[PDB]
């Protein structure tokens, strides 16, 4: 198996993002994210083995490809840039949030530093789009992008639930101007709901976006995605979401996402024969995540043998972005467990006597709900 075939991409850039009342308290995105995750890289010896990259920024233009002009030019430039801009979008910036913190914000949770936000949320998008450009050229077999601010949440217009540009998003649009008529899969195991992507890619039979998430009845952040939210007019039946309802108790974990995978996420995967798998890789269904963060007890062996089973598609070509996910221990057990399998090490499921129980029932009913509605669309999800 060739060497340097597996791509990582990290900068000291994304660790600049961070509320101006510096306290990591209260902002659960915070620049100990990444940092945290790429040193453990480093000592486990793994970082050695990749092909290791720096990253860029987005251009506006890369980022028009997902989001609006005035969200771009609100998020993607500074007062007062060496930006060539007319005077007509220099004075509708000029015609537009406070925290409790005192620092200035899109919301409550989405923060934004006025020296570094900017820059920091470009270098994100900028970055899992080069990791993957390599990854469809194929100089690179797949890799992983150790990125913040996270992206999912981002819509056209709409900064939102920490993210401000949808990079996972974005990394597909490129790649598809790049290599004409390619079909990009979008695996989303976030325990929130990738609003942002779904939306993006609703109507377009090019993009297969399945999203496992909690929703309990439209009540888990963000709200969003319904199982019978199957996508529209072209791309009816391009939307894949698990949403797993019923709540916390029982207790949601490897079984049932081991189960959505041999049911529902690789048979429709196979299907479907994507071009490329990009992964919105957030890590809150981890183990580590209280009630209203997650809630879940996926561990980092499960992911590591969800990135394996992924890598079974596309003739491996697989990008993970980080997303979701702040307890530290838990996202760089999880980080290490991805970056190995990228890599090619081999996961063992007979190692696991936790993997021998069955589905809770409330993750058998979520998933007869996604079968009952995808029939319509997948023969393996027929009869
Ligand atoms: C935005 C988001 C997750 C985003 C994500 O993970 N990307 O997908 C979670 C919000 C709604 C939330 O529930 C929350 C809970 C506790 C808290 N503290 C008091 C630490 C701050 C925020
Ligand atoms: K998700
Ligand atoms: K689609
Ligand atoms: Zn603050
Ligand atoms: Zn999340």
């Given at each position: 198996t060739?060497?340097?075939?597996?791509?990582?991409?990290?900068?000291?850039?994304?660790?600049?993002?961070?509320?101006?009342?510096?306290?990591?308290?209260?902002?659960?995105?915070?620049?100990?994210?990444?940092?945290?995750?790429?040193?453990?890289?480093?000592?486990?010896?793994?970082?050695?083995?990749?092909?290791?990259?720096?990253?860029?920024?987005?251009?506006?233009?890369?980022?028009?490809?997902?989001?609006?002009?005035?969200?771009?030019?609100?998020?993607?430039?500074?007062?007062?840039?060496?930006?060539?801009?007319?005077?007509?979008?220099?004075?509708?910036?000029?015609?537009?949030?406070?925290?409790?913190?005192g620092?200035?914000?899109?919301?409550?949770?989405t923060?934004?530093?006025?020296?570094?936000?900017?820059?920091?949320?470009?270098?994100?998008?900028?970055?899992?789009?080069?990791?993957?450009?390599?990854?469809?050229?194929?100089?690179?077999?797949?890799?992983?992008?150790?990125?913040?601010?996270?992206?999912?949440?981002?819509?056209?217009?709409?900064?939102?639930?920490?993210?401000?540009?949808?990079?996972?998003?974005?990394?597909?649009?490129?790649?598809?101007?790049?290599?004409?008529?390619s079909?990009?899969?979008?695996?989303?195991?976030?325990?929130?709901?990738?609003?942002?992507?779904?939306?993006?890619?609703?109507?377009?039979?090019?993009?297969?976006?399945?999203?496992?998430?909690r929703?309990?009845?439209?009540?888990?952040?963000?709200?969003?995605?319904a199982?019978?939210?199957?996508?529209?007019?072209?791309?009816?039946?391009?939307?894949?979401?698990?949403?797993?309802?019923?709540?916390?108790?029982?207790?949601?974990?490897?079984?049932?996402?081991?189960?959505?995978?041999?049911?529902?996420?690789?048979?429709?995967?196979?299907?479907?024969?994507?071009?490329?798998?990009?992964?919105?890789?957030?890590?809150?269904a981890?183990?580590?995540?209280?009630?209203?963060?997650?809630?879940?007890?996926?561990?980092?062996?499960?992911?590591g043998?969800?990135?394996?089973?992924?890598?079974?598609?596309?003739?491996?070509?697989?990008?993970?972005?980080?997303?979701?996910?702040?307890?530290?221990?838990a996202?760089?057990?999880?980080?290490?467990?991805?970056?190995?399998?990228?890599?090619?090490?081999?996961?063992d499921?007979?190692?696991?006597?936790?993997?021998?129980?069955?589905?809770?029932?409330?993750?058998?009913?979520?998933?007869?709900?996604?079968?009952?509605?995808?029939?319509?669309?997948?023969?393996?999800?027929?009869?």
């Amino acid at each position: 198996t060739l060497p340097f075939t597996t791509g990582l991409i990290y900068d000291s850039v994304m660790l600049k993002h961070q509320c101006s009342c510096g306290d990591n308290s209260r902002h659960p995105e915070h620049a100990g994210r990444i940092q945290s995750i790429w040193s453990r890289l480093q000592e486990r010896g793994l970082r050695s083995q990749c092909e290791c990259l720096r990253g860029r920024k987005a251009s506006l233009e890369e980022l028009q490809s997902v989001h609006s002009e005035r969200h771009v030019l609100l998020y993607g430039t500074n007062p007062l840039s060496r930006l060539k801009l007319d005077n007509g979008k220099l004075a509708g910036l000029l015609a537009q949030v406070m925290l409790p913190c005192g620092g200035v914000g899109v919301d409550t949770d989405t923060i934004w530093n006025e020296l570094h936000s900017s820059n920091a949320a470009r270098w994100a998008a900028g970055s899992v789009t080069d990791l993957a450009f390599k990854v469809a050229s194929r100089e690179l077999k797949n890799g992983f992008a150790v990125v913040r601010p996270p992206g999912h949440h981002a819509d056209h217009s709409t900064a939102m639930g920490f993210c401000f540009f949808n990079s996972v998003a974005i990394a597909c649009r490129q790649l598809q101007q790049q290599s004409k008529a390619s079909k990009i899969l979008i695996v989303d195991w976030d325990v929130h709901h990738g609003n942002g992507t779904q939306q993006t890619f609703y109507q377009d039979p090019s993009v297969l976006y399945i999203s496992l998430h909690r929703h309990d009845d439209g009540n888990f952040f963000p709200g969003s995605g319904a199982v019978d939210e199957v996508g529209a007019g072209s791309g009816e039946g391009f939307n894949v979401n698990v949403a797993w309802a019923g709540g916390l108790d029982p207790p949601m974990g490897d079984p049932e996402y081991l189960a959505a995978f041999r049911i529902v996420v690789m048979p429709i995967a196979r299907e479907f024969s994507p071009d490329l798998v990009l992964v919105s890789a957030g890590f809150d269904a981890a183990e580590g995540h209280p009630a209203p963060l997650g809630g879940y007890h996926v561990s980092a062996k499960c992911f590591g043998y969800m990135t394996q089973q992924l890598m079974n598609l596309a003739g491996g070509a697989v990008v993970l972005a980080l997303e979701g996910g702040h307890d530290l221990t838990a996202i760089c057990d999880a980080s290490e467990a991805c970056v190995a399998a990228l890599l090619g090490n081999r996961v063992d499921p007979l190692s696991e006597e936790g993997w021998k129980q069955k589905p809770n029932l409330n993750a058998i009913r979520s998933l007869e709900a996604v079968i009952r509605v995808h029939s319509k669309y997948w023969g393996c999800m027929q009869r």
